[PDB]
Amino acid sequence: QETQGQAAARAAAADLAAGQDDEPRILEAPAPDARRVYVNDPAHFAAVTQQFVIDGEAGRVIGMIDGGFLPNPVVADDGSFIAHASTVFSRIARGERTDYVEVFDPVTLLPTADIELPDAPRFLVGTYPWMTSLTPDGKTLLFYQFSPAPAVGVVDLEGKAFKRMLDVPDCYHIFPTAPDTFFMHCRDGSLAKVAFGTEGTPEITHTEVFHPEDEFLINHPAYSQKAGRLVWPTYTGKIHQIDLSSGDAKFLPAVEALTEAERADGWRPGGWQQVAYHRALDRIYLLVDQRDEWRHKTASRFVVVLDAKTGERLAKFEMGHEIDSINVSQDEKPLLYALSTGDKTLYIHDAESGEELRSVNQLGHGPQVITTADMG
Amino acid sequence: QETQGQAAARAAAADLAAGQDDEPRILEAPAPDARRVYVNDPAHFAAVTQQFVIDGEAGRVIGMIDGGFLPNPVVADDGSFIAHASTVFSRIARGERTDYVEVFDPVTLLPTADIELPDAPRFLVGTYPWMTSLTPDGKTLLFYQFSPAPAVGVVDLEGKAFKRMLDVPDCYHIFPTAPDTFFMHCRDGSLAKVAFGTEGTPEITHTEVFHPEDEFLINHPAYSQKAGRLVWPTYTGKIHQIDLSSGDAKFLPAVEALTEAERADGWRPGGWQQVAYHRALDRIYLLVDQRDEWRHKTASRFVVVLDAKTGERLAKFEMGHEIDSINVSQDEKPLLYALSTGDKTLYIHDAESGEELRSVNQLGHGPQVITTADMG
Amino acid sequence: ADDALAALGAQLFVDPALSRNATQSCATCHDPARAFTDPREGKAGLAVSVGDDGQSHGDRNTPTLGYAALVPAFHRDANGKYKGGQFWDGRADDLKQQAGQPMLNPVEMAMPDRAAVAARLRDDPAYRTGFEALFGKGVLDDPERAFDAAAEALAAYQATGEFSPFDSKYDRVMRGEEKFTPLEEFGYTVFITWNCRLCHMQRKQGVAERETFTNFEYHNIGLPVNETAREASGLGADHVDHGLLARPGIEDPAQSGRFKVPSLRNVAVTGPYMHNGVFTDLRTAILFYNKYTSRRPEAKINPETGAPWGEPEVARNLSLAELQSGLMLDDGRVDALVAFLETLTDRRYEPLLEESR
Amino acid sequence: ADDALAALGAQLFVDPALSRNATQSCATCHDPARAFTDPREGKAGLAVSVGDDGQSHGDRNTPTLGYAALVPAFHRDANGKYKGGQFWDGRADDLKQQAGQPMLNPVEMAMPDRAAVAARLRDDPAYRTGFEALFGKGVLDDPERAFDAAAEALAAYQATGEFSPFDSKYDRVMRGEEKFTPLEEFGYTVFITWNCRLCHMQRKQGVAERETFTNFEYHNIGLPVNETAREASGLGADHVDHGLLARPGIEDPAQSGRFKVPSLRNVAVTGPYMHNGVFTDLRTAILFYNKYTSRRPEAKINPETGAPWGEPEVARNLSLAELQSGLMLDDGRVDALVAFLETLTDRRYEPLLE
Amino acid sequence: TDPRAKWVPQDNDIQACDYWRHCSIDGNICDCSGGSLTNCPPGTKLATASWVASCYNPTDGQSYLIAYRDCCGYNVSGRCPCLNTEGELPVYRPEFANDIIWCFGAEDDAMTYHCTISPIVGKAS
Amino acid sequence: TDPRAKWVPQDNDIQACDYWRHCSIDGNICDCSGGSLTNCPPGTKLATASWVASCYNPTDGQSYLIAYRDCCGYNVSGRCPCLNTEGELPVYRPEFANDIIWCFGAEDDAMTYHCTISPIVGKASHHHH
Numbered sequence A, B: 001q002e003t004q005g006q007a008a009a010r011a012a013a014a015d016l017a018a019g020q021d022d023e024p025r026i027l028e029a030p031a032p033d034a035r036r037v038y039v040n041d042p043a044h045f046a047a048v049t050q051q052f053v054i055d056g057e058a059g060r061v062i063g064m065i066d067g068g069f070l071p072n073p074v075v076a077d078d079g080s081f082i083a084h085a086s087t088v089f090s091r092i093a094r095g096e097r098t099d100y101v102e103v104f105d106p107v108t109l110l111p112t113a114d115i116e117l118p119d120a121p122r123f124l125v126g127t128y129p130w131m132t133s134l135t136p137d138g139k140t141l142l143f144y145q146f147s148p149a150p151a152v153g154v155v156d157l158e159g160k161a162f163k164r165m166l167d168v169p170d171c172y173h174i175f176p177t178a179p180d181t182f183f184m185h186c187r188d189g190s191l192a193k194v195a196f197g198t199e200g201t202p203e204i205t206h207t208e209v210f211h212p213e214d215e216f217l218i219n220h221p222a223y224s225q226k227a228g229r230l231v232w233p234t235y236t237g238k239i240h241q242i243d244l245s246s247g248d249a250k251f252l253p254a255v256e257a258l259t260e261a262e263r264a265d266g267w268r269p270g271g272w273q274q275v276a277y278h279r280a281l282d283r284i285y286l287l288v289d290q291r292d293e294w295r296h297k298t299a300s301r302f303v304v305v306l307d308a309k310t311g312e313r314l315a316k317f318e319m320g321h322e323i324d325s326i327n328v329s330q331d332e333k334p335l336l337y338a339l340s341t342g343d344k345t346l347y348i349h350d351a352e353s354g355e356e357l358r359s360v361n362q363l364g365h366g367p368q369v370i371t372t373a374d375m376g
Numbered sequence C: 001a002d003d004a005l006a007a008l009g010a011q012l013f014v015d016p017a018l019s020r021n022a023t024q025s026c027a028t029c030h031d032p033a034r035a036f037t038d039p040r041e042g043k044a045g046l047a048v049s050v051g052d053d054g055q056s057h058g059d060r061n062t063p064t065l066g067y068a069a070l071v072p073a074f075h076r077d078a079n080g081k082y083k084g085g086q087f088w089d090g091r092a093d094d095l096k097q098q099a100g101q102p103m104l105n106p107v108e109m110a111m112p113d114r115a116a117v118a119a120r121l122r123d124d125p126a127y128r129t130g131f132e133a134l135f136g137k138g139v140l141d142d143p144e145r146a147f148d149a150a151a152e153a154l155a156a157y158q159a160t161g162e163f164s165p166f167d168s169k170y171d172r173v174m175r176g177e178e179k180f181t182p183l184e185e186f187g188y189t190v191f192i193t194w195n196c197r198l199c200h201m202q203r204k205q206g207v208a209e210r211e212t213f214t215n216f217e218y219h220n221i222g223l224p225v226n227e228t229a230r231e232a233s234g235l236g237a238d239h240v241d242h243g244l245l246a247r248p249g250i251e252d253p254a255q256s257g258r259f260k261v262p263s264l265r266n267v268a269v270t271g272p273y274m275h276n277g278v279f280t281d282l283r284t285a286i287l288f289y290n291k292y293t294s295r296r297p298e299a300k301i302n303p304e305t306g307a308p309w310g311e312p313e314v315a316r317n318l319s320l321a322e323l324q325s326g327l328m329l330d331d332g333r334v335d336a337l338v339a340f341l342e343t344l345t346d347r348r349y350e351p352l353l354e355e356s357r
Numbered sequence D: 001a002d003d004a005l006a007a008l009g010a011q012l013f014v015d016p017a018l019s020r021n022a023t024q025s026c027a028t029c030h031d032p033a034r035a036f037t038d039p040r041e042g043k044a045g046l047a048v049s050v051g052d053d054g055q056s057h058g059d060r061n062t063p064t065l066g067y068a069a070l071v072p073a074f075h076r077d078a079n080g081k082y083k084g085g086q087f088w089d090g091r092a093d094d095l096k097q098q099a100g101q102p103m104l105n106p107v108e109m110a111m112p113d114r115a116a117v118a119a120r121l122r123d124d125p126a127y128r129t130g131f132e133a134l135f136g137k138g139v140l141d142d143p144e145r146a147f148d149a150a151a152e153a154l155a156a157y158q159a160t161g162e163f164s165p166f167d168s169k170y171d172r173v174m175r176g177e178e179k180f181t182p183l184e185e186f187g188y189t190v191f192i193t194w195n196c197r198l199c200h201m202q203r204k205q206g207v208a209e210r211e212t213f214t215n216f217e218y219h220n221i222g223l224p225v226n227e228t229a230r231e232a233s234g235l236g237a238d239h240v241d242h243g244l245l246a247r248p249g250i251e252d253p254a255q256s257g258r259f260k261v262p263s264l265r266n267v268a269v270t271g272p273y274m275h276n277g278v279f280t281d282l283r284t285a286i287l288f289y290n291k292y293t294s295r296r297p298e299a300k301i302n303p304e305t306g307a308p309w310g311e312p313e314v315a316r317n318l319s320l321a322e323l324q325s326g327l328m329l330d331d332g333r334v335d336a337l338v339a340f341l342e343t344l345t346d347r348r349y350e351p352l353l354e
Numbered sequence E: 001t002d003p004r005a006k007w008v009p010q011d012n013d014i015q016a017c018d019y020w021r022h023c024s025i026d027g028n029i030c031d032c033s034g035g036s037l038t039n040c041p042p043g044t045k046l047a048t049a050s051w052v053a054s055c056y057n058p059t060d061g062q063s064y065l066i067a068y069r070d071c072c073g074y075n076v077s078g079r080c081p082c083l084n085t086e087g088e089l090p091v092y093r094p095e096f097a098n099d100i101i102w103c104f105g106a107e108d109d110a111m112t113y114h115c116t117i118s119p120i121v122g123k124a125s
Numbered sequence F: 001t002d003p004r005a006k007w008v009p010q011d012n013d014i015q016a017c018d019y020w021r022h023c024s025i026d027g028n029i030c031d032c033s034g035g036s037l038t039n040c041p042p043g044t045k046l047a048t049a050s051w052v053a054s055c056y057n058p059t060d061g062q063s064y065l066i067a068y069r070d071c072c073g074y075n076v077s078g079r080c081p082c083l084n085t086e087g088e089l090p091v092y093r094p095e096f097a098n099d100i101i102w103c104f105g106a107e108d109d110a111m112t113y114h115c116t117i118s119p120i121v122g123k124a125s126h127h128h129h
């Protein structure tokens, strides 16, 4: 009811009346928790970008982190640090390129490491969360490189040094599953498992081809590292699920996010981060709307919620705003975060009821990526 | 009535129908001319900023130049180069600061000089054109330094080198009159004349104090280096004109831009670049509106035009938009540029009649500064 | 008329009476069974061809005549780029200016002079009748007229539909008569989005009416010397093939080592490749491009020899801006490009593709 | 009670019988006519004071007693900054604990012991009466009680409105009774927007009820030795005055060379300045702060000597964060500040301004 | 304007996001920051890389291959932003994928995105 | 909503541009990017420089000196931007001037503008305002 700015004015007035002293200083952010959410603003390819650290419970910006060109943010699931791989140039968008990884303390937001990446090796692309990824123990950051060929960069966060590039096949995205292993999705319709050492040709294994050549898997699959669940929608809201928790890929049964009559009536997923997965609830959330088949990056106004095991629909929420990305807190009674690139607003919904609870606006220019830590 | 995009669609279709080939390549901007106008977007203090190069005749963006934090643009009046003093940091907004001057070729927009300024000596302030200035011969750039004390930096554009800092007294802004001389405006209400040889203290002379302690002279006076006319409004629309065309300051009759009556009904100048001066017309343009005495930075919806010689009002335009900055082309039948920070749009008016002819929208985030070359 | 002139060229084209020892016609080196290239083994394999004396080898690989009639005559366009002409170095302006050269080249057909050519033409009553009907009585008695008339007949013959039928699978696909295999279609997609497009397509933009997969420009792509061909041709260990700079009247050192971009039509059947026949296999010619892009050690190794490609014969004026694309072709994209380029084979040479596969 | 106690303190304060040769009272060094500081010219000018023996000089400048009753008792606050106390090095906890020290200091009043103090108290029938009525019969026969009672009386006398009248121009202006002159108001504006207010204001934010222009913290501002004063003190040319670190209980090396932020009240009339009286002029004191900000050759030079300021007596723990403000005070701001500081002069010392 | 409606090409205004050649553009139309439909703005560098789409030209009934190319080395122009995705395939079919900054090949190693041009390279298969 | 009307201080919401202490603020309210009314957000550096305004507090009718201070070393927050100019004088009266980036004194020489705080430092009034 009372806004945060209102509660602050009240307290400031009380301190003045009471003669209360206080030292102006640099605040710490509150301890990272399950309802912290980070919104990255790729800013529609601006050379500099911003990340907003948000208390989702209060709907309050608690901090910000600056970044360079299309950085890839990662958040350690255990809340110990956050980091990004970023790119700057010596004269704004021109001149000598430096790619680097910074690691930040999640309370002071001070960079505790700044690790140069040799030979400007980052893949510059509209931000895909799974193109730069932390290994589960948090000691390694992996980043994708496209040019000259698909490759993956290995960065030692603990020793604060770049390690090596690994050559991989014609494959994309990086879902780490262990300190030395990740999966990628390959042009031929398989996943590739890549197991790497400090030196030597990485061991690369392919799964069976798991989708036909004309079934399109979106750029923003949800991957729960702690569950090893890769939830990969196709353009039609068909959802591939791959279980990587054994260390090898087990293909789960496909589910449809939309019914036959919905599909016949033009319903399709669309947006940017189209799918979220709540690990504890084993639940998929998909951004859908009625749309032509090639409007697959436009906002959507509905979220369907479906049991990941059975594909049973549990809800269809009318979000009431143009939503491009969703994600969920990973605690019980999760929040469903619904980020509107066009409104630059994070809408914070009760994931159970779909009700909008609060919102955080003025999140940059073109905010697209929501990240939460799964701390539980 | 055909728009630029429409005309372009037809040319393309015609080339396609006629089977006419063309090599995709980097265009050159049209040669600089009187109707080129530059719009600088300090972007409400963002760490990187943009300058838009605009063909005022067609209302068309013909190029852009990237800048760092609150850079100071200058445009050689002869159209031979543009330059800015800019500021970058090794990590977006943090880390080692580099101040530098870049000079650019006005057609390829390529930088032809990048000149480091030692000891990060630039004054960081919302953009005031006369905080950085070209000497009439275009060979020297002078920039203001506030910290630790008012000082002026001498940069050799010809040798492409920084030279030295000049100690000045408690004074502000820089109005070059000569290869070795400029005026500054002082706290004690005088102007100072700073003549610098190649070495030692400059020779500093003060004029008579020309305004009382409680008359406030705006941060954005117009200065026509070619006329040597310094046009300096105060908060009430009183206008100091100082003739610097002889090497020394001759104070012109002071004039009121607003009638004694108007000032009684709340009329005051307001905006950013509140004043423009057309050298060949000896004419002052002032952004005015009805406002409280302390809303002096708000947009104004009206422009008044007056004779620099007599002070007689010549016109009063209802701009039809919220205008923050004005300037004028220095050719015959000038355009009156009316830049709206709020709309991010340069409205291009006929200076004679005040009709809005065309406009160029999407000029960054908070564009505030209009520059034109005075090429006649 | 256009018919009779081409029919006369058809006879000249296959007539070995136009070589000193009467062993060699145009058709000998430009064999119509082989997309007008030379199937014969010489001291450097198929890299370079052997002349009528049976010993002399050229220093350049014999190119197809297919589609050579679509090349513009040699000129310098407004951007200062040379275009068109005939021979790998553009030193002939057009087909007509090229046609009498092999006749008089002691390395090729080796007739001593125009008069020896005319005397051969007189010996044959069909030529007297055929030349006379098109060029007038006594044409064969004037060595200059006879020689020029033979070149004109030969250039007319090369302009006929038979040399440029446009009946490749690619042509059929572009008419909607059929579709590319999925591999071919990928090959086409890569060809037109990667750097090949910057040189092996007629136009910078828009659609060509009779595409022949060359922009007719001159580029030094930084090829090494073909040692065995260079030994066979006898030009010397210290010889440099300067490409376009060898054309009389080109003086600009920036043209040294640039050769005419070949039409990729029938490329699948006209191996070995490049101006000196240096690469045997189509795949090798495509892989050469990865030397500019790939960071892998193997990108620098010619797979036909296991050794480095070699220092460029001309180390200057390389087309680095186009070549250093920042993107390496993986083997699937190389396969796709082979399959696409095979679609550029004329209908009548489709049977020859079986062996190359 | 508080009235009679103060009135007893008032008698002791001027009584030279509390010195060994009966030549010196508190008032000799803290002369009421000079905002409770020492007018007496000595070997080192007015930089240090001379004790009862007519020979011993101190090694520190005698500070005003005005407003010293506003300073909190010595303590370490929750951010780890020490605050309050008395003496330049806060070695006394409060006024009561400070009062007995001059009496027994051989370089000052030089009484040998508390008994000798008590005996002098016993000689004066008026003291028997005054002390006994406040502390009980026989108080002067017990030297411990006698001396504590004397210190308590002196501290109560220092806590009277007479020592802290808040009747400066600044006080009158803050009460809306008067206006600052343009120069004074400019000086006040500079003082509260420049680094001075990071140390010479009671509070970080909000408005103080009884502002004394000090946050009661300890800072090393990097001052040099006062050579003549240090000569006169006889402590020797080796000697290093460690300021706060000399307080018993303070072990923390970060505290070496730090001294209590003086109240700027009456500053215009209590020259020379700083803990060792090194600067005779108020203007010099202000100029000293430019050594940290200004790039100008003159900022390096003490304008009283024409020579460089001197290396800090203690070249560690400088308050660089505050002192390196990035801004230099031009002559205008220095003038403005002098005008402003002069407004902190108590009404009764307004005539001393010349 | 209904963002989710089937895209409807027009061949009458190249600055508008429904212009027929922009059927798979992502970013900003170069025509709006001083380039043109098929040329880069001054100061920027023309990439040699491209991604493609088959775009229907309502003027002639024909579908053309538009092999987009980025103009690089400047911050994003901020003028005429557009994102269309006709035929757009995910990043693993990169020749049809448009979130990628297709600045490879640009002079001076320029890799920042400023805007995109829309030249034709073929009639569609 | 009328940008030219006399500014009307309120004492009920610090994130709004008409909050009484923001009477000469220029930039962004630190309270909207993880600071508070009088503290900087994490990661930024608090400048020791300030400019002052005397701001009228509607609540007690007293006028207070607000010594604005910048939080520096981050790109501008972009949240709760405000520009007010009560008593604001031009740059040659820098003590009252608010286009200046008042980042001097900030740790690490941070000079980029992120947001401004609005702490009270005195009562008192100005001749000019």
Ligand code: HEC
Pocket (backbone or CB within 6 Å): C013, C024, C025, C026, C027, C028, C029, C030, C049, C050, C051, C052, C058, C060, C061, C062, C063, C064, C065, C068, C085, C086, C087, C088, C089, C095, C098, C099, C100, C102, C103, C107, C108, C109, C154
């Ligand atoms: C083998 C000894 C040959 C005989 C007999 C003929 N040609 Fe030839 N041709 C040959 C080579 C080695 C080359 C390239 C030489 C070089 O300097 O580049 C050629 C080239 C042509 C061309 C130009 C084709 C192109 O550049 O794309 C034409 C049009 C041509 N040849 C035609 C031609 C005719 C008409 C002949 C009989 C008169 C003839 N050739 C004989 C090898 C040999």
Ligand code: HEC
Pocket (backbone or CB within 6 Å): C194, C195, C196, C197, C198, C199, C200, C218, C219, C220, C221, C223, C258, C259, C260, C261, C262, C263, C264, C267, C270, C272, C273, C274, C275, C276, C282, C285, C286, C289, C319, C322, C323, C337
């Ligand atoms: C201009 C910079 C080019 C680019 C990019 C590509 N090619 Fe090319 N190609 C070019 C020239 C100048 C030549 C002749 C080089 C010489 O000196 O001989 C070629 C040749 C080929 C060939 C051999 C054809 C023949 O011998 O008849 C093939 C198969 C070929 N080129 C293919 C090719 C592909 C698939 C490309 C994209 C990877 C490609 N080229 C780029 C000029 C240029």
Ligand code: HEC
Pocket (backbone or CB within 6 Å): D013, D024, D025, D026, D027, D028, D029, D030, D049, D050, D051, D052, D058, D060, D061, D062, D063, D064, D065, D068, D085, D086, D087, D088, D089, D095, D098, D099, D100, D102, D103, D107, D108, D109, D154
């Ligand atoms: C000169 C011989 C003095 C006589 C007699 C007295 N005092 Fe003093 N006082 C003197 C000096 C040199 C100093 C500073 C010494 C140091 O080490 O810092 C002082 C200090 C005080 C203080 C502390 C003031 C402050 O820190 O702000 C108090 C409260 C004080 N003096 C009181 C005092 C009394 C009550 C005296 C009579 C018993 C007395 N002083 C004598 C110099 C001399």
Ligand code: HEC
Pocket (backbone or CB within 6 Å): D194, D195, D196, D197, D198, D199, D200, D218, D219, D220, D221, D223, D258, D259, D260, D261, D262, D263, D264, D267, D270, D272, D273, D274, D275, D276, D282, D285, D286, D289, D319, D322, D323, D337
């Ligand atoms: C904390 C880092 C401070 C800042 C910033 C300023 N001052 Fe200060 N001042 C400080 C201390 C600790 C002391 C005593 C220093 C010592 O060791 O002796 C002082 C002293 C003064 C004085 C002398 C007062 C007296 O001797 O009674 C004056 C006149 C003074 N200070 C003024 C002043 C001004 C005007 C400042 C802003 C330019 C200023 N100081 C900054 C602590 C600090």
Ligand SMILES: [Ca+2]
Pocket (backbone or CB within 6 Å): C037, C061, C062, C063, C064, C270, C271, C272, C273, C274, C277
């Ligand atoms: Ca060949």
Ligand SMILES: [Ca+2]
Pocket (backbone or CB within 6 Å): D037, D061, D062, D063, D270, D271, D272, D273, D274, D277
């Ligand atoms: Ca003193």
Ligand code: NA
Pocket (backbone or CB within 6 Å): C044, C047, C226, C227, C228, C229, C278
């Ligand atoms: Na060979």
Ligand code: NA
Pocket (backbone or CB within 6 Å): C244, C245, C246, C247, C248, C249, C250, C251
């Ligand atoms: Na030549």
Ligand code: NA
Pocket (backbone or CB within 6 Å): D244, D245, D246, D247, D248, D249, D250, D251
């Ligand atoms: Na101690």
